[PDB]
């Protein structure tokens, strides 16, 4: 798994090529992979950690 094969590279490309076309028709959801990387409660926690670092450094 540390190496890649010619089988591994084509399977990585074809699975990634088929999922973007699976979004235009929207027969896949892909909502778990969106909001977990958005994570808007972390994004404000990122903001609140940025907000306190204004307050601590002033």
């Amino acid at each position: 798994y540390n190496n890649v094969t010619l089988k591994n590279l084509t399977a990585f490309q074809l699975l990634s090529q088929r999922e973007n076309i699976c979004e235009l028709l929207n027969l896949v959801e892909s909502t778990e992979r969106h909001n977990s990387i958005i994570n808007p409660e972390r994004q404000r926690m990122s903001l609140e950690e940025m907000k306190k670092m204004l307050d601590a450094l002033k």
């Binding site: 084509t10 399977a11 090529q17 973007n20």
Partner: protein, 244 residues
Amino acid sequence: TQTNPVPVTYPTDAYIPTYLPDDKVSNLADLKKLIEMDSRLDLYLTRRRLDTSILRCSITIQLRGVDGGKVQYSPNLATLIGMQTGSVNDAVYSIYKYILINNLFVTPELGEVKLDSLLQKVLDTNAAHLPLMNVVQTVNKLVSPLPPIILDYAEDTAKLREITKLALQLNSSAQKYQFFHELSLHPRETLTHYLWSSKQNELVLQGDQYFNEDAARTSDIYSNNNNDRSLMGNISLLYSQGRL
């Protein structure tokens, strides 16, 4: 460390996209300001880390403080230097500066020194020319130790890896933007490209299936597979080279 960098299996400092429309992000250049800020801070720190160092019996007792910090001198080496018992590295440097003051090398021309009276006295040599390698070698001989008492009668790697892992997640969403963007730019010549390349990648992944254990031990490879045509046509070629 080595003379070459150490290869690692986790990624090290992945790139940041620049084709991203920065009117929407407006933070790539400000994050770029942080990286050159950190590297200049890393430049000053690594420079500072480099620059912070740039019958009657006798009493014989082997003491606790037998140390080579103040090491004894031979009396010839003592009077050429001047000090009584300083150190061994100061003995080498004061000897080397004494030859450099007297200008004995040349006016090997630099290896051979002009042996003066004191230099012939401290080395017990009598040549006119002698290399400096053998001069400093006897300084390892001319120095004796001190005599005892005689009485007679991290987290930053995982932080970098997490930042390397999170930058890989940034490279995914930027590429996922631009494909649909260039599909919004051209829906024609990326779907015709898709319908060819996904067909081509379907061909490549389906190139390895007739090489299993019980797929070759049976005879549904050789017999009647002229529709296959792939093997059993090389027997006119492999026998012609003796491969059998």
